Each structure stands twice: as C-alpha cells, then as structure tokens.
C-alpha cells in the first residue's frame, strides 16, 4: 500500500483510533497475554541501498502476566542507538536506561538553560547543652528537610539515611577561661573514622576569645545509618566551651551535595 | 483485521503518513477535551481486551478560539504517565505543566547536571544604616530568585525558597567585642525565633578578624535580607570601607 | 472508521509499518539525511479547515548508505515541535540541540529530590610556601569532571567554565603576629579580587591554631589554576605548614 491511511470521525463522543490488539491462543480459544509479549508497534523502515532497515519504532510490551495484572511499558527506539526512552507500568521514565527506579531516570548528563527547583536534603543541630562523650555534644534541638538526613530522632547527632555526599560545618563558642578550645565532627564520637579517610575533607580550628567560634568541617561521602556527632575532644575542654540553648552558641549544619 | 498495515512511499519528496482527523457534528469545530485521535494498544487478559498503553492527541481549547492540543502517553498500570501540553511543556507523573519539564517524584541522574543557580552577594560595608542593616558599596546576583542590586541595604528575596546565607565583617582596632547579624529588614528575631531555621553569630575582637553570622532555611517572596551591627554604638568598632575583604553577605538558593 | 490490527499467537504481534525509499519500486535509492520515514499526524476541524493537531515523526539524520540514524519528533498543536529524540538517544525538550542525554530549554520543577554527580575538589595539608598566594599542598582529591585537584600540587585546575564556590583556611602559628591567606588565580589575587561579578574576601587572625580564611564565589574559565596562600614569604614563618588537613585546606564546589 502506498496511500496514506486516513481515519476520520465526525461526532461528539467517538474518535478516530488505530487499535492494535494482542492475544495468545486463537480466535476460537483466546489466551491471556504473558510477560514480555509485544502488544503492538508503530514501526518505521528505510531503504539503505540493499535492504529495508529498522528506522525507529514505538512499542507496547507486557511486563506482567495479564491473568495476574495488566502492566505494560512503552518503548521509543531510534535508528542508531536503539531503545532510547522507556515508560514503565509505574509511570516511571528512563532515558538511556530500562531500569526505571525513580519517576525520571537519566543515564547521562542533563543540561538545563533555566533553573531547577526540587527538595534538597539538609539538616541542623542547634544549642549545645551538655557534653555526652568525646566529640559528642547533646543538642537542644534539630531540624531537617528531605529524606537523606534525620536530625531530630537523636539528641546527640544527625543520622544519615541514604548513601551520599555531605557537606558539614560545626561551630561552637569559646567560654571565658582564655584557654585554647576546639570541637570536631565525628562518626558517633569517632573522629579518626572520618579524618583518616583519603577521600574526604576533615578540618578544625582552635579559638580562645570569649564568644568566638571554633569550627570543624567535613566534606565527603557517608554511609546510611551513620550518626554524625560534633563536640569537644575531652571533658575538661568541654568545661571551657559555652553550653546553652540559643543556637548562636553552637550549631551543626549538614547538606546533601549530590 | 489480522494483517499488518503497511504504508510505503518511494521518491524524492513524499512520505508515508497515518492521518487521524476529528470534527464534531456530522461538520462542527473540535471542542476542548475532544480526542483528535489515538494509537491504542489492547491485550487479552482472559476476560477482556484491556488497555495496554496508548498515545493520544487531545484538544486543550475550542478550535474556533485556538488550535491547542496535548499529547498523552499512557501505560497499562499507572494510566497516563507523560503529557506534552500545547505550550510544549512536559509533565511526568503530573498533568500540571507549569515549567518546560515537571516531574512529580524524584529524578536520578547518573552523570552531572548543569543549570542556572540563583545566588547573590553584597560587598563592602560602607556605613551603618540601622540595627542589623549595613549600607553596602555594591551587590551582584545571578538568576531570578535574589535581587542584590536594587537596594544598597539588602538583598530582596524574589521567590519563596530555601536559602543559605553567610555574612562576615572585620573588627576594627578598639579591642572591644563586636558582632554582626543577618536580619529580615533589620529584624533579627523574625529569623532567629523560628524553629525551622539555623541562625547563629559569633563575636570577635582581633583587628581584621571576622565576626560571622549564618542563616539556613526558607524565606518568603518580597523579604529584604540585611546584615549589620546590632547597635549604632558598635559601628565605630567595626571596619566600614569599600573593599570586599572588609565585609560581605552571600546568599545561595538551596532548592 | 477505526483501523484494527488483531494478532493471536505465542510470538506474532500487530504492526503498523511505514517505509520510505527514494527512487522507484524497481530502482529504489537510499534514504537521505532529513527525509521523513513516516509519521502519525493528527488534524482537527476548526470551522474553516483541517488544522495540525500534533504529530509523531521519524526523520533520517544520516544517509542510510552510510548508517541508519534517525530521530523521533513529537509536535503539539500550538508550540509545534516539543520533544526530539536523536539517533544517539539524546532527548531535547524545547530545543533541537541534543548535546547531552537530556536537554531542557526552560526551567525544571521536581516535587521530590534529585540525585546526580556533583563536581567538587579539595586540597589538604599546606606543606610549603611556593609563591605569593600559592601554597604547596600535600594532597588533593576530586569528584566529577569540572575540577582537577590532583594533577598540580599548587592548586586546583578548573576544567570546564562554570561557577565555583571556594573557601581556603590555614592555621596561625605561635607568634601572635597578624597573618592571612588569600585565594588567587595562579598566585594573582587581583585577577579575582578586582572583578565586579565575584565575591572575594579574606580575614586576619593571630591566635595559635585559629584560622585565617579566604572566600571566592563566581565564574571561572577552563584551565584556570586556583591557588591559595600567604601574601608574602616573610609571613610563612608565622603560619603552620604540615601534612594534617586541620592545618589548612582549600575546598572548591561547582555551583551550577
């Protein structure tokens, strides 16, 4: 056939449709579609000199046995790369991947000419009120947004809930002793577990002026279930830091970077 | 009926088309919500020919007013998965297509993302305007969320969102304890008292050292963010001069 | 007036097939770049005429005697072409330039969270004074494609034009003298500080183990080498140079 196929509908309820139907069995004994069965396709082909070659296609394919549930995907294929985009039965879209774990998945880079808005995971601790253990203050409160960090369940740190990269800064005020003081960020009180890693930034300063801040910083990947703490290295140095409710006396801030 | 449908075109200028046409009446112009056509997939489940994906073209306006349509991509299971509106705007998991791409869910990218990020700065505290409000010699910004140039005394938040802010200023030569604070148009409490934000500040005295103040949390459109000394009598003990190393305010949109 | 294609069987399926050649049936010729292989077109009556109401096209991106390469195009009534999928699999929304795997000409709104690789790098351990505003650093580390902190001991090299947020710190020694460091472009502080489109600052400190800090925020160019250190050699005697990162670090994050 060389003629364009025209489907024309006049009316208020009806529409024009190309309908592609798939069953197993026969018209006399139809059987349910099975996982992996192609329901149908719109196929493009082009002459290359010697053969008709696949030149793009849009496919509907079953992803569950239909006697169990009607679940399908849509596939968009181009000449060259082959399958370029998938829409799974969940509605989840993959570009360059067929594993559609999130609502949109891109196997590659993304370039946007304007701006991107999204929920970003971050959390804070505020108000160092007592020394719990080395490198672990008790904090009066915490707060967080998103799903990667929990800063409210534990009074002594922020819990990492997802593997990821995190940027962390902890500050606390020196008291009035005039002695040198510092705080450090730690993994459940273990400073070395962070500081000794060759894939992170870990630092801290000293201070002595009353009301000035000693600071500690971390940048790098953390593991789910990690409790991030911050505090004085030892009890006698905690005696020389300010412990009180207002956040200006001390805070920890954690941002998910990636 | 059981046979594949083929459309074959040869030659230099023409192409193969499946064309689906819709009118109302028997002829009446297409109305909003009318389907122009669809490619429909159906599969036997043992009881019926069940919807197994479809690609639809649907009118978004009455055609006597304007020819506006959307394209819809449906799957068996979730139903409509992706929409392209007459604006070209794409929705995945939503039919509300406000921006060029809208995703109702999370996005996972294996590589890196480039985009315009909103941020703004104030540089060079040149005088005390009010409690927690310096006059700044200049400002600069990128993007659409923050305006650091219209006013010399603060950065205006143009869009509701989450912001990370740090303000620093140098102590002078008095040896007195000095500090600065970030504020909402001079009102420090309006930020500090919130249980959904970080707000802090340090003291310093050594000449050329920084007092710093930090904020993290949501701000509202039209908010004017300021930073400065808590009281006029302290201004004499801070450094006010043009170079940015004397003091700056940095605002980054986080989300 | 519907068109139905029904298939019963274990392996057979229903297809609409659109084929394109040049030439004639007895003397065909290969598809050329820009030829349409086929299309699904929608049209709607507006009262006067049949108006374009969306289309899905397959179009050649190479001469087929060289290679079979096509794109898919999705057009809507109103804006016209809205999405393109190139032969590489790269997708454009609002643009036909498909440089990356996804390209959006506009804004993007996500209700949830986005995960992606972010470029960042660090230098750790100021071990010597090399030149004004240039420390030698014991080690570097980076993630991503925009920043290289391991090739040069004296800085982080920007590999791609972009916006960067940079903080450098170093500990004062035991003298009680005023010390500072600054971020620089290959030791040239003024090259950054004098720019009206950037933040550049630094502090002084004197207390032993306290930090002097310098900060930068703004755009940088490919091949820029970012350094940080004391302003002059005589001040090195009053800063701490040693391997542990708590003595000093530089952190660079790509912002955009």
Residue numbers in the entry:
A (entry chain A): 850 to 1107
B (entry chain B): 850 to 875, 879 to 1107
C (entry chain C): 852 to 1107
Q: What did the article's authors report about this structure?
A:
Bdellovibrio bacteriovorus is a bacterium that preys upon a wide range of other Gram-negative bacteria, entering their periplasm and consuming them from within. Proteomic and structural analyses of vesicle contents reveal several fibre-like proteins, which we name the mosaic adhesive trimer (MAT) superfamily, and show localization on the predator surface before prey encounter. Using independent but complementary approaches, we identified and characterized a MAT superfamily of trimeric fibre proteins with diverse adhesive tips, able to fulfil the long-sought-after role of multiplicity of molecular recognition and handling of diverse epitopes (across a wide prey range), by the bacterial predator B. bacteriovorus.
We next characterized two more divergent NS74s, Bd2439 and Bd2734, obtaining a tip-only variant of Bd2734 (residues T691–L843, 1.8 Å) and a longer construct of Bd2439 (G837–D1107, 1.6 Å). The resulting structures reveal that both proteins use a related fold. Bd2439 is modular, formed by a β-helix N850–V968, a R969 linker that coordinates the carboxy terminus and a compact β-domain tip from S970–D1107. Mapping a sequence alignment to Bd2439 identifies a conserved interfacial pocket (Y1031, R1040, E1044, H1053 and H1055 from one monomer; R1022 and Y1097 from another). These residues coordinate two hydroxyl groups from a bound ethylene glycol. The multiplicity of the MAT family prevents exhaustive and absolute specificity determination (as suggested by our knockout phenotypes), but we use Bd2439 as a proof of principle to link to recognition of bacteria with Proteus-like O-antigen chemistries, revealing a molecular basis for B. bacteriovorus prey handling.
